[PDB]
């Protein structure tokens, strides 16, 4: 019936919180794996996006070097848009 964005397994950052929605149960599970948050995981998302939809052509590590700060978060949300019909990786 209506719209609906909750589970009954225990979450880690976003639960009791906006965006948590926003996400598809993709990128659901992606936060709840990189213990992250939906405005924020919005936010490095966004910046990925807009940083690979500008150009065209985005390379990985780039990313690594772009937004978060580490590597192994850029490199789960990076691997998402990558590997999915939104950025790139060359």
Do not use: M, W
Not at 21 to 43: D, F, I
Not at 62 to 86: C, H, M, P, S, W
């Amino acid at each position: 019936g209506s719209n609906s964005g909750r589970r009954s397994a225990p979450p880690l950052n976003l639960t009791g919180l906006p965006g948590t929605e926003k996400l598809n149960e993709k990128e659901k599970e992606l936060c709840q794996v990189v213990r992250l948050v939906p405005g924020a995981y919005l936010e490095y998302k966004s910046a990925l996006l807009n940083e690979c939809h500008k150009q065209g052509g985005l390379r990985l590590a780039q990313a690594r070097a772009l937004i978060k700060i580490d590597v192994n978060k850029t490199r789960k949300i990076y691997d998402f848009l990558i590997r999915e019909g939104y950025i790139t990786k060359a």
